Coordinates of C-alpha atoms (C1' of nucleotides) in Angstrom, one line a residue:
Chain A
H1 CA -9.7 -18.1 7.1
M2 CA -8.8 -14.8 8.6
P3 CA -11.5 -12.1 9.0
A4 CA -11.1 -8.8 7.1
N5 CA -10.6 -6.9 10.4
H6 CA -7.8 -9.1 11.7
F7 CA -5.0 -7.1 13.4
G8 CA -1.5 -8.5 13.4
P9 CA 0.5 -11.2 11.5
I10 CA -1.4 -13.6 9.3
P11 CA -0.8 -17.2 10.4
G12 CA 1.2 -19.1 7.8
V13 CA 2.8 -15.9 6.3
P14 CA 6.3 -15.2 7.6
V15 CA 8.2 -11.9 7.0
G16 CA 10.0 -12.2 3.7
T17 CA 7.2 -13.8 1.8
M18 CA 7.0 -12.5 -1.8
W19 CA 4.2 -12.1 -4.4
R20 CA 4.4 -10.8 -7.9
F21 CA 1.1 -8.9 -8.0
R22 CA -1.1 -7.0 -5.5
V23 CA -4.1 -9.3 -6.0
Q24 CA -1.9 -12.1 -4.7
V25 CA -1.1 -10.2 -1.5
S26 CA -4.9 -9.7 -1.2
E27 CA -5.6 -13.4 -1.6
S28 CA -3.1 -14.1 1.2
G29 CA -5.0 -11.7 3.4
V30 CA -1.9 -9.6 4.2
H31 CA -3.3 -6.6 2.4
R32 CA -6.9 -6.9 1.3
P33 CA -7.3 -3.8 -1.0
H34 CA -5.8 -4.6 -4.4
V35 CA -5.3 -0.9 -5.2
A36 CA -5.4 1.2 -2.0
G37 CA -2.2 1.6 0.0
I38 CA -4.1 1.6 3.3
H39 CA -6.5 -1.1 4.5
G40 CA -8.6 0.3 7.3
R41 CA -11.9 0.9 8.9
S42 CA -12.7 4.4 10.3
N43 CA -14.0 3.1 13.6
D44 CA -11.4 0.5 14.2
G45 CA -8.0 1.2 12.6
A46 CA -5.6 0.2 9.8
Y47 CA -4.7 -3.4 9.4
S48 CA -2.0 -3.0 6.7
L49 CA -0.4 -0.7 4.3
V50 CA 1.9 -0.8 1.2
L51 CA 4.9 1.3 0.3
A52 CA 4.9 1.5 -3.5
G53 CA 6.3 4.9 -4.4
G54 CA 2.8 6.2 -5.1
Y55 CA 3.1 9.3 -3.0
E56 CA 6.0 11.7 -3.4
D57 CA 5.9 12.5 0.4
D58 CA 6.7 9.0 1.6
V59 CA 10.2 8.6 3.3
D60 CA 11.4 5.0 3.6
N61 CA 14.2 4.3 6.1
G62 CA 13.7 0.6 6.8
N63 CA 12.8 0.2 10.5
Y64 CA 11.5 3.8 10.4
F65 CA 9.5 5.5 7.7
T66 CA 7.1 8.4 7.2
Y67 CA 4.0 7.3 5.3
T68 CA 1.5 9.7 3.6
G69 CA -2.2 9.5 3.9
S70 CA -4.3 8.9 0.7
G71 CA -6.5 11.4 -1.1
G72 CA -6.0 15.1 -1.8
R73 CA -6.3 14.0 -5.4
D74 CA -8.8 14.5 -8.3
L75 CA -9.6 11.1 -9.9
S76 CA -12.4 12.4 -12.1
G77 CA -12.0 10.6 -15.4
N78 CA -12.0 7.1 -13.9
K79 CA -8.5 7.3 -12.6
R80 CA -6.9 5.5 -9.7
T81 CA -4.0 7.9 -9.1
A82 CA -2.9 11.5 -9.7
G83 CA -0.8 14.3 -8.3
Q84 CA -1.8 16.2 -5.3
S85 CA -4.4 18.8 -6.2
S86 CA -6.1 19.5 -2.8
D87 CA -5.6 19.2 0.9
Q88 CA -5.9 15.8 2.6
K89 CA -8.3 15.1 5.4
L90 CA -8.3 13.1 8.6
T91 CA -11.1 10.8 7.3
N92 CA -11.6 7.3 6.0
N93 CA -8.2 5.5 5.6
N94 CA -6.3 8.5 7.0
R95 CA -8.4 8.4 10.2
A96 CA -8.2 4.6 10.3
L97 CA -4.4 4.8 10.4
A98 CA -4.3 7.5 13.1
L99 CA -6.4 5.2 15.3
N100 CA -3.5 2.8 15.5
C101 CA -1.5 5.4 17.3
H102 CA -1.6 4.8 21.1
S103 CA -3.4 8.1 21.8
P104 CA -6.9 9.6 21.3
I105 CA -7.6 10.8 17.8
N106 CA -6.6 14.5 17.4
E107 CA -7.6 16.7 14.5
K108 CA -4.2 18.5 14.7
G109 CA -2.1 15.4 14.9
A110 CA -1.0 13.3 17.8
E111 CA 1.8 11.4 19.4
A112 CA 1.7 8.0 21.1
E113 CA 2.0 7.3 24.9
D114 CA 4.2 4.2 24.5
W115 CA 4.0 3.5 20.7
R116 CA 4.4 -0.2 21.3
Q117 CA 0.9 -0.5 22.7
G118 CA -0.6 0.9 19.6
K119 CA -2.4 -1.3 17.1
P120 CA -0.2 -3.4 14.7
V121 CA 0.1 -2.6 11.0
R122 CA 1.2 -5.2 8.5
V123 CA 3.7 -3.6 6.2
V124 CA 4.3 -4.6 2.6
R125 CA 7.1 -3.1 0.4
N126 CA 6.5 -3.0 -3.3
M127 CA 9.3 -2.7 -6.0
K128 CA 7.9 0.5 -7.4
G129 CA 9.2 2.2 -4.2
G130 CA 12.7 1.3 -5.3
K131 CA 12.9 4.4 -7.5
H132 CA 13.5 6.4 -4.3
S133 CA 14.3 3.7 -1.6
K134 CA 17.0 1.1 -1.1
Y135 CA 14.7 -1.1 1.1
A136 CA 12.2 -1.9 -1.7
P137 CA 12.4 -5.4 -3.1
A138 CA 13.7 -5.8 -6.7
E139 CA 10.5 -7.5 -7.9
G140 CA 6.9 -7.6 -6.8
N141 CA 5.8 -7.4 -3.2
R142 CA 7.4 -8.4 0.1
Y143 CA 5.9 -8.6 3.6
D144 CA 8.3 -6.8 6.0
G145 CA 6.5 -7.4 9.2
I146 CA 4.6 -5.5 11.9
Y147 CA 5.0 -1.7 12.4
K148 CA 3.3 0.7 14.8
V149 CA 2.3 4.4 14.4
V150 CA 4.6 6.5 16.7
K151 CA 2.9 9.7 15.7
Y152 CA 1.1 11.5 12.8
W153 CA 0.7 15.2 11.9
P154 CA -0.4 17.4 9.0
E155 CA 1.9 19.7 6.9
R156 CA 2.4 20.9 3.4
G157 CA 3.9 18.3 1.1
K158 CA 6.2 18.9 -1.9
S159 CA 3.2 20.0 -4.0
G160 CA 2.2 22.8 -1.6
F161 CA -0.9 21.0 -0.5
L162 CA -1.6 19.7 3.0
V163 CA -0.9 16.0 3.5
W164 CA -1.2 13.8 6.5
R165 CA 2.0 12.1 7.7
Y166 CA 2.6 9.1 9.8
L167 CA 5.8 7.9 11.5
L168 CA 6.0 4.2 11.6
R169 CA 8.4 2.0 13.5
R170 CA 9.1 -1.7 13.2
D171 CA 8.1 -4.0 16.1
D172 CA 8.7 -7.5 14.9
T173 CA 10.9 -10.2 16.3
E174 CA 11.7 -11.6 12.9
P175 CA 14.7 -10.0 11.1
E176 CA 14.3 -7.4 8.4
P177 CA 14.3 -9.2 5.0
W178 CA 16.7 -6.5 3.6
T179 CA 19.5 -7.2 6.2
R180 CA 22.0 -10.0 6.1
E181 CA 20.2 -12.0 8.7
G182 CA 16.9 -11.4 6.9
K183 CA 18.4 -12.5 3.6
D184 CA 19.7 -15.7 5.3
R185 CA 16.4 -16.4 7.2
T186 CA 14.6 -16.2 3.9
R187 CA 16.9 -18.7 2.2
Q188 CA 16.7 -21.1 5.1
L189 CA 12.9 -21.0 5.0
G190 CA 13.3 -21.5 1.2
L191 CA 10.9 -18.6 0.4
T192 CA 10.6 -17.6 -3.3
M193 CA 8.7 -15.1 -5.4
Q194 CA 5.2 -16.5 -5.9
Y195 CA 3.3 -16.1 -9.2
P196 CA -0.3 -16.7 -10.1
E197 CA -1.0 -20.2 -11.4
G198 CA 0.0 -20.5 -15.1
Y199 CA 1.8 -17.1 -15.2
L200 CA 5.4 -18.2 -15.7
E201 CA 4.3 -20.4 -18.5
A202 CA 2.1 -17.8 -20.2
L203 CA 5.2 -15.6 -19.9
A204 CA 7.6 -18.0 -21.5
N205 CA 5.1 -18.3 -24.4
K206 CA 4.8 -14.6 -24.8
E207 CA 8.6 -14.5 -24.8
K208 CA 8.6 -16.2 -28.2
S209 CA 9.1 -13.8 -31.2
Chain B
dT1 C1' 16.0 4.6 -16.3
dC2 C1' 9.1 8.3 -19.1
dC3 C1' 4.6 10.0 -18.3
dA4 C1' -0.4 10.3 -19.3
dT5 C1' -4.9 7.3 -19.7
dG6 C1' -8.9 4.7 -18.8
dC7 C1' -10.9 0.0 -17.0
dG8 C1' -12.4 -4.0 -14.2
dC9 C1' -12.7 -4.9 -9.4
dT10 C1' -13.2 -5.1 -4.2
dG11 C1' -13.7 -3.2 0.6
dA12 C1' -15.9 0.5 3.3
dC13 C1' -20.1 2.7 4.2
Chain C
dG1 C1' -26.5 1.1 -4.2
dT2 C1' -21.9 4.8 -4.5
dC3 C1' -17.3 5.9 -3.9
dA4 C1' -12.2 5.5 -3.1
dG5 C1' -8.3 3.9 -5.0
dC6 C1' 0.4 3.5 -3.2
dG7 C1' -2.7 -1.3 -9.8
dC8 C1' -1.2 -2.7 -14.4
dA9 C1' -0.1 -9.4 -16.5
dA10 C1' -2.1 -3.1 -20.2
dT11 C1' -2.1 0.7 -24.0
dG12 C1' -0.7 5.1 -26.4
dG13 C1' 1.8 9.6 -27.3

DNA sequence: TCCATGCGCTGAC
DNA sequence: GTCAGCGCAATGG
Protein backbone atom coordinates (compact mmCIF):
# COMPACT_ATOMS: atom_id res chain seq x y z
CA HIS A 1 0.00 0.00 0.00
CA MET A 2 1.07 3.60 -0.64
CA PRO A 3 1.92 5.84 2.32
CA ALA A 4 -0.22 8.91 3.05
CA ASN A 5 2.67 11.23 2.10
CA HIS A 6 3.41 9.62 -1.27
CA PHE A 7 4.23 12.22 -3.95
CA GLY A 8 3.41 11.44 -7.58
CA PRO A 9 1.29 8.89 -9.50
CA ILE A 10 -0.25 6.01 -7.59
CA PRO A 11 0.92 2.70 -9.12
CA GLY A 12 -1.98 0.91 -10.77
CA VAL A 13 -4.04 4.07 -11.35
CA PRO A 14 -3.71 5.56 -14.88
CA VAL A 15 -5.00 8.97 -15.91
CA GLY A 16 -8.62 8.60 -16.97
CA THR A 17 -9.66 6.39 -14.04
CA MET A 18 -13.13 7.27 -12.78
CA TRP A 19 -14.97 6.94 -9.46
CA ARG A 20 -18.54 7.87 -8.61
CA PHE A 21 -17.89 9.08 -5.05
CA ARG A 22 -15.09 10.91 -3.23
CA VAL A 23 -14.66 8.10 -0.66
CA GLN A 24 -13.70 5.84 -3.56
CA VAL A 25 -10.98 8.20 -4.71
CA SER A 26 -9.75 8.16 -1.10
CA GLU A 27 -9.68 4.36 -0.97
CA SER A 28 -7.62 4.35 -4.16
CA GLY A 29 -5.19 6.69 -2.45
CA VAL A 30 -5.27 9.28 -5.24
CA HIS A 31 -6.89 11.83 -2.91
CA ARG A 32 -7.05 10.81 0.77
CA PRO A 33 -9.32 13.48 2.27
CA HIS A 34 -12.92 12.61 1.42
CA VAL A 35 -14.10 16.21 1.82
CA ALA A 36 -11.18 18.68 1.58
CA GLY A 37 -10.05 19.81 -1.86
CA ILE A 38 -6.39 19.80 -0.81
CA HIS A 39 -4.43 16.89 0.67
CA GLY A 40 -1.31 18.23 2.30
CA ARG A 41 1.10 18.52 5.20
CA SER A 42 2.39 21.96 6.20
CA ASN A 43 6.02 20.83 6.51
CA ASP A 44 6.05 18.76 3.32
CA GLY A 45 3.65 19.79 0.57
CA ALA A 46 0.38 18.97 -1.19
CA TYR A 47 0.01 15.47 -2.63
CA SER A 48 -3.26 16.02 -4.45
CA LEU A 49 -6.22 18.30 -5.04
CA VAL A 50 -9.71 18.20 -6.50
CA LEU A 51 -11.48 20.68 -8.74
CA ALA A 52 -15.17 20.48 -7.80
CA GLY A 53 -16.65 23.94 -8.27
CA GLY A 54 -16.54 24.50 -4.52
CA TYR A 55 -14.72 27.84 -4.80
CA GLU A 56 -15.99 30.67 -7.00
CA ASP A 57 -12.45 31.84 -7.66
CA ASP A 58 -11.17 28.64 -9.36
CA VAL A 59 -10.46 29.02 -13.12
CA ASP A 60 -10.17 25.76 -15.07
CA ASN A 61 -8.48 25.76 -18.48
CA GLY A 62 -7.35 22.14 -18.79
CA ASN A 63 -3.55 22.03 -18.95
CA TYR A 64 -3.60 25.28 -16.94
CA PHE A 65 -5.82 26.34 -14.07
CA THR A 66 -5.92 28.79 -11.20
CA TYR A 67 -6.81 27.00 -7.97
CA THR A 68 -8.05 28.68 -4.78
CA GLY A 69 -6.81 27.92 -1.29
CA SER A 70 -9.29 26.66 1.29
CA GLY A 71 -10.64 28.56 4.27
CA GLY A 72 -11.73 32.16 4.65
CA ARG A 73 -15.04 30.63 5.64
CA ASP A 74 -17.20 30.45 8.76
CA LEU A 75 -18.32 26.84 9.26
CA SER A 76 -19.88 27.38 12.71
CA GLY A 77 -23.03 25.27 12.77
CA ASN A 78 -21.37 21.99 11.84
CA LYS A 79 -20.94 22.99 8.19
CA ARG A 80 -18.43 21.75 5.59
CA THR A 81 -18.73 24.64 3.13
CA ALA A 82 -19.89 28.28 2.94
CA GLY A 83 -19.27 31.52 1.08
CA GLN A 84 -16.17 33.61 1.73
CA SER A 85 -16.57 35.63 4.93
CA SER A 86 -12.96 36.37 5.89
CA ASP A 87 -9.43 36.57 4.44
CA GLN A 88 -7.54 33.37 3.65
CA LYS A 89 -4.19 32.60 5.23
CA LEU A 90 -1.00 30.95 4.03
CA THR A 91 -1.37 28.18 6.65
CA ASN A 92 -2.26 24.45 6.72
CA ASN A 93 -3.38 23.23 3.28
CA ASN A 94 -2.72 26.62 1.64
CA ARG A 95 0.89 26.50 2.89
CA ALA A 96 1.24 22.84 1.93
CA LEU A 97 0.39 23.68 -1.68
CA ALA A 98 2.76 26.66 -1.81
CA LEU A 99 5.61 24.34 -0.80
CA ASN A 100 5.17 22.39 -4.05
CA CYS A 101 6.29 25.49 -5.95
CA HIS A 102 10.01 25.30 -6.79
CA SER A 103 10.91 28.32 -4.66
CA PRO A 104 11.24 29.15 -0.95
CA ILE A 105 7.95 29.86 0.83
CA ASN A 106 7.07 33.56 0.60
CA GLU A 107 4.33 35.26 2.61
CA LYS A 108 3.53 37.64 -0.25
CA GLY A 109 3.42 34.95 -2.91
CA ALA A 110 6.12 33.45 -5.08
CA GLU A 111 7.08 32.16 -8.50
CA ALA A 112 8.97 29.00 -9.39
CA GLU A 113 12.54 28.76 -10.67
CA ASP A 114 11.83 26.01 -13.23
CA TRP A 115 8.30 24.94 -12.31
CA ARG A 116 9.01 21.41 -13.57
CA GLN A 117 11.27 20.71 -10.59
CA GLY A 118 8.52 21.53 -8.12
CA LYS A 119 6.75 18.75 -6.22
CA PRO A 120 4.03 16.85 -8.18
CA VAL A 121 0.33 17.25 -7.46
CA ARG A 122 -2.18 14.55 -8.38
CA VAL A 123 -5.18 16.31 -9.91
CA VAL A 124 -8.75 15.04 -9.80
CA ARG A 125 -11.62 16.72 -11.66
CA ASN A 126 -15.14 16.30 -10.26
CA MET A 127 -18.40 16.76 -12.21
CA LYS A 128 -19.67 19.57 -9.95
CA GLY A 129 -17.00 21.72 -11.59
CA GLY A 130 -18.83 21.32 -14.89
CA LYS A 131 -21.23 24.13 -14.01
CA HIS A 132 -18.42 26.53 -14.98
CA SER A 133 -15.87 24.33 -16.81
CA LYS A 134 -15.86 22.25 -19.99
CA TYR A 135 -13.05 20.00 -18.72
CA ALA A 136 -15.03 18.52 -15.82
CA PRO A 137 -16.26 14.95 -16.32
CA ALA A 138 -19.99 14.39 -16.81
CA GLU A 139 -20.26 12.10 -13.81
CA GLY A 140 -18.28 11.46 -10.64
CA ASN A 141 -14.52 11.91 -10.39
CA ARG A 142 -11.69 11.57 -12.92
CA TYR A 143 -7.93 11.48 -12.36
CA ASP A 144 -6.36 13.87 -14.85
CA GLY A 145 -2.70 13.34 -14.04
CA ILE A 146 0.20 15.25 -12.50
CA TYR A 147 0.39 19.07 -12.32
CA LYS A 148 2.97 21.45 -10.81
CA VAL A 149 2.55 24.80 -9.08
CA VAL A 150 4.05 27.46 -11.35
CA LYS A 151 3.29 30.28 -8.89
CA TYR A 152 0.89 31.46 -6.18
CA TRP A 153 -0.21 34.85 -4.93
CA PRO A 154 -2.85 36.57 -2.81
CA GLU A 155 -5.56 38.95 -4.05
CA ARG A 156 -9.20 39.86 -3.48
CA GLY A 157 -11.63 37.27 -4.84
CA LYS A 158 -15.13 37.90 -6.23
CA SER A 159 -16.46 38.21 -2.67
CA GLY A 160 -14.13 41.07 -1.77
CA PHE A 161 -12.11 38.97 0.67
CA LEU A 162 -8.52 37.96 0.22
CA VAL A 163 -7.95 34.48 -1.22
CA TRP A 164 -4.78 32.60 -2.11
CA ARG A 165 -4.39 31.62 -5.73
CA TYR A 166 -2.23 28.95 -7.34
CA LEU A 167 -1.38 28.52 -11.01
CA LEU A 168 -1.06 24.87 -11.90
CA ARG A 169 0.30 23.40 -15.08
CA ARG A 170 0.11 19.84 -16.35
CA ASP A 171 3.29 17.76 -16.50
CA ASP A 172 2.21 14.25 -17.46
CA THR A 173 3.19 12.09 -20.45
CA GLU A 174 -0.25 10.47 -20.63
CA PRO A 175 -2.78 12.36 -22.79
CA GLU A 176 -5.47 14.60 -21.28
CA PRO A 177 -8.60 12.46 -20.78
CA TRP A 178 -10.73 15.28 -22.23
CA THR A 179 -8.96 15.39 -25.59
CA ARG A 180 -9.50 13.04 -28.53
CA GLU A 181 -6.35 11.05 -27.81
CA GLY A 182 -7.33 10.91 -24.14
CA LYS A 183 -10.81 9.67 -24.97
CA ASP A 184 -9.25 7.00 -27.19
CA ARG A 185 -6.62 5.95 -24.66
CA THR A 186 -9.36 5.52 -22.05
CA ARG A 187 -11.37 3.24 -24.35
CA GLN A 188 -8.32 1.16 -25.27
CA LEU A 189 -7.54 0.65 -21.57
CA GLY A 190 -11.23 -0.18 -21.15
CA LEU A 191 -11.65 2.17 -18.20
CA THR A 192 -15.19 2.66 -16.89
CA MET A 193 -16.92 4.54 -14.08
CA GLN A 194 -16.42 2.60 -10.87
CA TYR A 195 -19.14 2.34 -8.23
CA PRO A 196 -19.02 1.00 -4.65
CA GLU A 197 -19.93 -2.69 -4.37
CA GLY A 198 -23.70 -3.17 -4.49
CA TYR A 199 -24.43 0.42 -5.52
CA LEU A 200 -25.75 -0.08 -9.06
CA GLU A 201 -28.02 -2.83 -7.73
CA ALA A 202 -29.33 -0.76 -4.80
CA LEU A 203 -29.92 1.97 -7.38
CA ALA A 204 -31.96 -0.25 -9.71
CA ASN A 205 -34.07 -1.26 -6.72
CA LYS A 206 -34.61 2.33 -5.62
CA GLU A 207 -35.66 3.04 -9.22
CA LYS A 208 -38.84 1.00 -8.82
CA SER A 209 -41.94 3.08 -8.15
C1' DT B 1 -30.51 23.88 -14.82
C1' DC B 2 -31.77 26.09 -6.88
C1' DC B 3 -29.94 27.11 -2.44
C1' DA B 4 -29.70 26.44 2.57
C1' DT B 5 -28.79 22.79 6.43
C1' DG B 6 -26.68 19.68 9.55
C1' DC B 7 -24.16 14.93 10.17
C1' DG B 8 -20.77 11.10 10.16
C1' DC B 9 -16.04 10.63 9.17
C1' DT B 10 -10.87 10.98 8.36
C1' DG B 11 -6.25 13.30 8.08
C1' DA B 12 -3.26 16.84 10.23
C1' DC B 13 -1.54 18.39 14.44
C1' DG C 1 -7.94 14.83 22.22
C1' DT C 2 -9.56 19.18 18.62
C1' DC C 3 -10.25 21.11 14.27
C1' DA C 4 -10.73 21.60 9.10
C1' DG C 5 -13.49 20.48 5.54
C1' DC C 6 -13.94 21.70 -3.24
C1' DG C 7 -19.20 15.74 0.46
C1' DC C 8 -23.91 14.16 -0.15
C1' DA C 9 -25.80 7.51 -2.00
C1' DA C 10 -29.19 12.94 1.94
C1' DT C 11 -33.15 16.24 3.54
C1' DG C 12 -36.07 20.58 3.64
C1' DG C 13 -37.88 25.24 2.21
